[PDB]
Design a protein around this nucleic acid. Sequence first.
RNA 1: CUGUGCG
Length: 1592
Amino acid sequence: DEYVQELKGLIRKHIPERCEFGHQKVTFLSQVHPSPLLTEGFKLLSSLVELESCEAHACQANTDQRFVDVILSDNGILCPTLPKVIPDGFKLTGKTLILLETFVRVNPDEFEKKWKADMSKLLNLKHDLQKSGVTLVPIVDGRSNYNNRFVADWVIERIRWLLIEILKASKSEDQEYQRLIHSLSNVKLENLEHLKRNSLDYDERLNESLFIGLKGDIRESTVREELIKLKLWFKDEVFSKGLGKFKLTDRRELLESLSSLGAHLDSDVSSCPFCNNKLMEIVYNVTFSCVERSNIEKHYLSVLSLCNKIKGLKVFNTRRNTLLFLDLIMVNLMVDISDSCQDAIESLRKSGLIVGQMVMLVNDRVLDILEAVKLIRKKIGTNPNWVKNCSKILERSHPEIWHHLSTLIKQPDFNSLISIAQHLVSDRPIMRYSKICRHKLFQEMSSFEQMRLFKTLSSISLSLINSMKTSFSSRLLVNEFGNVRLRECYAQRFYLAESLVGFLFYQKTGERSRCYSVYLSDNGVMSEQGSFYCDPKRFFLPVFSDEVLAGMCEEMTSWLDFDTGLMNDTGPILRLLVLAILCSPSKRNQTFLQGLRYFLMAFANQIHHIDLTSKLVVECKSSSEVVVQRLAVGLFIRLLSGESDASLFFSRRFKYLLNVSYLCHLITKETPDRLTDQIKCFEKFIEPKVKFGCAVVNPSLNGKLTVDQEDIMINGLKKFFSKSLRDTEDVQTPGVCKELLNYCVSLFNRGKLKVSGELKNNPFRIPKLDELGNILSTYDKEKLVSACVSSMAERFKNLDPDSTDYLILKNLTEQVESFNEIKHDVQVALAKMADVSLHEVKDFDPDVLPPEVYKELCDAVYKSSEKCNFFLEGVLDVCPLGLLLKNLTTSSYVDEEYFMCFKYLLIQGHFDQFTNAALRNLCFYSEDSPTEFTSISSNSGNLKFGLSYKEQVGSNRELYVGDLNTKLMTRLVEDFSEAVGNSMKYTCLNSEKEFERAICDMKMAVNNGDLSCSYDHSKWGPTMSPALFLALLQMLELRTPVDRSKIDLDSVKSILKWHLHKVVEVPINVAEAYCIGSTSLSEEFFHQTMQLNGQIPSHIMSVLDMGQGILHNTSDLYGLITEQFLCYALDLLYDVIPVSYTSSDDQITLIKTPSDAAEWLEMICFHEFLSSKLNKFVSPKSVIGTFVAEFKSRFFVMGEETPLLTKFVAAALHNVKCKTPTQLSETIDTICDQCIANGVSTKIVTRISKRVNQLIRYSGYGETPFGAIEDQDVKDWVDGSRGYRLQRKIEAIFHDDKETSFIRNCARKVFNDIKRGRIFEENLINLIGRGGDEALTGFLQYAGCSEQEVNRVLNYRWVNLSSFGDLRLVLRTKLMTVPTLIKTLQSKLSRQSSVASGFIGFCKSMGSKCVRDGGFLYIKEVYSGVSACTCEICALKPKIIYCNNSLNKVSQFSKPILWDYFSLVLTNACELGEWVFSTVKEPQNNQNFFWAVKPKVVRQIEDQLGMNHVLQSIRRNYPVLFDEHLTPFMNDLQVSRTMDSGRLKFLDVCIALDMMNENLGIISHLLKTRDNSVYIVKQSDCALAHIRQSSY
RNA sequence: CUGUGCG
Ligand SMILES: [Mn+2]
Ligand SMILES: [Zn+2]
């Protein structure tokens, strides 16, 4: 006991703050025995930890450690026979309980495991306690450290060290000892030697069911002879019988097949699309009614804007009366406008924004003056004081910033109102809800109206997205088949011509699909244009793409200018097809275009599968797919009807049709319906499993199986490996024959393949799983509400205003629905802590009761019944505790909606009514730590996975989410597999050199004419099984490089069989949809597995899953070795030369033949048979000819490569992620560089830049001299960065480049004397860091100037709103969450929402107080503060640049632009040389002269630019910024400290510019590869390239 | 939290 007395001495620094410190301490002092003292030491430490955890949250210690039932029976409460559970901290007040259970886990994984376990075990008790008792709120405090606020945090580590020393000094179980010794460590991979590996009478039958036929020692000549005999048998048993899988194209017959499948002849639709689709007829009507045909309006718009701003304050705490006040103001200003200037209502007002007795108001709602009067005369007599009272609130407790001098207090004279009403006739709309063709023959129209069609489409799309952008929290004053009258709908406006305006009327709000009606107003007259029904989210693409599509069309058609006349009958149909695709966003259309891509791939080449036509036919609905399908097939026929073999200008035809097929990518891939999306993903997940028949019901979730479960697992394993080498019945069922595994393994072992096992670099060196895609989880909501109510009860030390809702907004950043739900939850929780029968038998939750079960009439009339004690007089905004329910009922009653009133009434009626291994595993003991593992688990779970989907253009892609332990095991397996793959050479998944080698090999083979085999494999993911990898690694040896020690992968085998024992959860939403309840296989399976066998199915368990996204590289290497075996076999049999490349989903086989290709079908069929014998089913989409090759959608043809224009332009048009305008412009620059890399066009990128500039300008931000990409660029995207193009734009701003020339001369001088001229550097940073203008001067006198230059160059100024920081803004981001260069460095050191909704959030957020000063303010006052001096110097570029006296009123946000010119010039000097110092000179082709170009950049900045160079420079120059906000999480700073090649050539000088300026982003741009290294360019664009070369 | 413009 050398330390026991030392422990007694050291534990003397402890405060007995509570009594039982004293009690436990005196028990500890008075006991000296070997066995207990450790026990009470650990339990006292745990008690101290739990008290520190819970008394920080107003705890009440459970000193007796009793159950919930007795503490609830302490006072008067009925016992509902609650299940037993021991609480750590309890807080009971009135009829509310707060329970806190805390724990400590140093290791994270155990921390989240215990966290999930405790919340799961506590949540289920709420459903029982609430049913016939009181409520509760579960909270848990998880700490990863033993730290506390009662000790000086230097003894606890010493206490732990001394305790572990004491326990290791002497003992007296084994696993308990290991757990306790490992749970007191702080920081601790492979080599799991300490694991027990105990058997449970199950390993054996797994072994002989998997490792009986595996030898891996078969010699070579026997394999040769066996393959010979197999080939001879195959030749005359299945090939001579005509039972193959591939055949020749037979072009013409394929044309009739395509015409039959696509061109519908049994359909009743007409051959003119305009009347087939509602959008087509609507746009046709508007465009052919439009082509053939004053300060009052701005005042009206201004007053609308100001009332629209003031309404958002909601300072009246009520809605309907607020709306009545606002529209009363609107009508008062209306009648004050109409009293004078009588020539305004008929002429200047009708032609603006008005229609029959229907005037728009705040919140973009159109309202009728008649019923407006019918509602204004209310509250008159009942309470005429109202208008007075709401007037008096505009003086006190109001912003008092208004122009309502007289337009507010005047009573509306109803005589003028009725006179105005009778002045305008009744033309109320009908909005038709739920056959003669004069459709103008679009094929015989001029070449101008199509662009007008496109502009009309863009206007309609933007109007739809504006209607999307409207507010959600809007309730109509008066509520309302086949024809509904419109009186109080919502409206949007759009502009077409000087006199006529289009209007869009819609009745409902939200984000889901609605019904809309389109009307027109020519000269005050109302016209009917149409109506339709759609979901706005799928029309973000055409919002401004009215020009890029056009020029794309002319270029696309002009590709076919080899023959004159073919453009005439192919162009107009091409634009019509593009329009049809744009107006019809659906998965079926893009799948159909992909099917046409596959059809073209089959047809243009020589050999194709026999099962293509079944994968091209898609069922049609709504008669909308038929027209686009007919258009596509007609185009294909017209291009392919005549002589169209491979003996003519066929490459351009192929490119044309391929781009036509890729036109599918314009469709937004964002799962139009979500619940059906989970249904589809789940059923396509579960169909192969059940059709195999090995899916069991919910397992034990802890590593226990029943006899039936293990028996069916054995049956599945036996069935999978029960395939023969001769039977042809098993060609589609999953499985494989172990014999061929033995063959391939044995042949690989004796170095007979292209590679061997001579590996180097030895590899042995909190969301809920049940729901994916939901914004919030039950666990997260419970935690947030627990924290909220804890803070609530904490501050009451009554009365509570609505400001508590602010806290709800503080912790967060469908969403509004969850916010309202949690607001109601916290309201009712506060209410209960302050102090129709079908719901009883059904779910007892009153907040989930749907309004679809009862009529609205009974709901409205029952809430208006007698109520004495359930309502109170007045609104009573103070809301003291004890009467919250009455206030909520009154607030819901005064508002139009009664559903909240109904549920509040319902809930107001109370209608909701001394061993060391067992007694020491509840305080802090880490029992769940993995110490002994079985064949099926690892003592820490059963590898629970969660299912999810990912949107793709073609079809939804499966995805699996893993827990933390599963995540780490999967990542270590992946690391080992990647080590093996790096040992491999031919793999192409992440090794770019091999990818380039494959590209060059395929291109040279195509140029020579070798045979191509682009194998595409179907159902690659779900069909594979881990058992394949188990057997493969069992038969493998993995020899070491030099030691030849035959590495034993026992840990790898165990972890892989663990993955074989993975369990997957089914989402709760699909389970509920099936339970609530067309014939579906999954539906029948679920209904068969509800009660017939066991309980509801929530966990699925089987063998052959191979979850996509988890076993990438293992599957890659398996497929690689298998294809190597097959290529070796085919080479040895048919003496032909194979080579192959693998990408784990599709592969490439290049075949060089000796010594016209119709004699080689037999080898392809034999290879297909061999692959099908393996678990390598090949999709029918493969093309096995020798004309064109495909790999990862990178096609190669004889002579050149496809330009892939439409895919890239669609990508550039879409995925405009809006966070800040600068980042948007940079992303656009990157995507345009990528687009121009593949020789697209130079006139199209200009249109994209114009479109994005127009889009950002519409947002109200305003154009900037940088803005988006410059207009009218050139092919000099090559050898040019963002700096160069920005400099070119700046030069283009100035017509006569006169001061730019001199300032470039000055920049040339400063570059000259900073590179080698005399001595400089390290003095510039002193000048740079302060500010703006004096620095201009300082450079000027460093180069030589006078005061005239000083006061002349500083004249050009531009407005920068982001001057005092960054634009504060909140977007529609995921719930629950310093120069930028430092942030990028931090990120690089470290290792669901729609684009439409993102744009909506951007536009909504920038309109609030975003710019900062001093304070936050708006933008409009900033832009209106400018002075329009117009002194002939601020007019050459309006709204871009300004002169000094033009910005006298506001000057903080005003900088000169020539500093940006310095920034760009010095950036180019550091980046790509000094040749940009010259003057641009201009120079003094059949559309088909394409060729590749290389960058011609020269770098004098030590082009290598290794890592840790900038870190040393920033440490030297800016130690203050180096210390904090930089390199906290780093351990190898020492290499950077000891002169890591410090004092670079130019790194020191031009990094401070990026420090100061936040629109360059050069250093981050500096440290990456160009990623292109080649650019496709036409000689037509090369002809007019500008020349800029600099002399010495 | 707090959207009003493409002429
Ligand atoms: Mn492929
Ligand atoms: Zn028609």
